[PDB]
Ligand binder design. Structure first.
Ligand SMILES: O=C(O)c1ccc2c(c1)nc(Nc1cccc(Cl)c1)c1ccncc12
Length: 327
């Protein structure tokens, strides 16, 4: 179960619960203030009191600790842990309080896109943020607009400074890698086909995420693996032959081709809605085709070929940045 807490209640004599920020499958996240940071507001993740979620949070904390000792002064746009503790079996982590995540704001705007300069700056942050993560033997395994926070989402949102949050899935290079790892919508072909994954996973997701920013809607609105693959093929091109010879999950294929009932409800859905990636472009200017060229390289089927965030940052699309955007 959860925790015995209403508003005004105190934790460890530092925080007072002023209200709820959200609640999920892991526990609560509440808004607070601090005695010793004096007046200071924080989001306070509070993991439930069950064995498995506890041991899990611990691993997460280890991640946030590592993030907090490389990012010397904090130029890398990761959510900052300000404190953690074991408040009676419920692991608790104090994060610095931020705005709404890039998806709420998109929902509140009735799912209509951020303009290109908005995207371009968010992409820039995202690449930069995760490249920092990747050069420290990490993979966030759960990127998705819900997990990217605006520092402040005053509204067009006034300031496109963002943060990456919820490292509850971040995995180190030594650690055991689970077979399946992303959010269905942001999950790369190598994971669907169970070919092992690592950092490139993140880049695939990031592509999906930038698509969603630019158009307002999820790129792979799907629920089953087979459909998901078919969407991939229609939008990005045929799945590279060596990836099919190399896959255990052959149920999805026949004679090196995807098995698909085009007349099924998902078949018809795909035919009506899924189009080549180029054709989802709004305008044909340069700063648009550049963005899409980036996205396509981010959505390379083959994770050994897929561009890296270190390479992504050397892209002519980012040329369109404000020098105050630049840092
Ligand atoms: O996991 C983290 O690192 C994490 C870290 C910080 C926040 C967060 C999740 N979620 C917030 N929002 C939120 C919104 C809906 C549901 C839930 Cl459970 C939480 C939030 C808000 C303001 N400042 C920091 C955060």
């Amino acid at each position: 179960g959860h925790l015995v807490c209403r508003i005004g209640d105190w934790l460890q004599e530092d925080y007072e619960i002023v209200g709820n920020l959200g609640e999920g499958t892991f526990g609560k996240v509440v808004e607070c203030l601090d005695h010793a940071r004096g007046k200071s507001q924080v989001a306070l993740k509070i993991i439930r009191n069950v064995g498995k979620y506890r041991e899990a949070a611990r691993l997460e904390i280890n991640v946030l600790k590592k993030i907090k000792e490389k990012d010397k002064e904090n130029k890398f746009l990761c959510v900052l842990m300000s404190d953690w503790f074991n408040f009676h079996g419920h692991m608790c982590i104090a994060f610095e309080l931020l705005g709404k995540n890039t998806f709420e704001f998109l929902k509140e705007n009735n799912f209509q896109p951020y303009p290109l300069p908005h995207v371009r700056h968010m992409a820039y942050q995202l690449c930069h943020a995760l490249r920092f993560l990747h050069e420290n033997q990490l993979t966030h395994t759960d990127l998705k607009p819900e997990n990217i926070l605006f520092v402040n989402s005053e509204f067009s949102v006034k300031n496109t400074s963002i943060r990456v949050a919820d490292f509850g899935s971040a995995t180190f290079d030594h650690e055991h890698h689970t077979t399946i790892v992303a959010t269905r919508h942001y999950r790369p072909p190598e994971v669907i086909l169970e070919l092992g994954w690592a950092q490139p996973c993140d880049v695939w997701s990031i592509g999906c995420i930038l698509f969603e920013y630019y158009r307002g809607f999820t790129l792979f609105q799907t629920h089953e693996n087979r459909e998901h693959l078919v969407m991939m093929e229609k939008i990005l091109g045929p799945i590279p032959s060596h990836m099919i010879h190399r896959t255990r999950k052959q149920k999805y294929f026949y004679k090196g081709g995807l098995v698909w009932d085009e007349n099924s409800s998902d078949g018809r859905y795909v035919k009506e809605n899924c189009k080549p990636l180029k054709s989802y472009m709004l305008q044909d200017s340069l700063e648009h085709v550049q963005l899409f060229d980036l996205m396509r390289r981010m959505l390379e089927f083959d994770p050994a070929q897929r561009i890296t965030l270190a390479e992504a940052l050397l892209h002519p699309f980012f040329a369109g940045l404000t020098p105050e955007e630049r840092s």
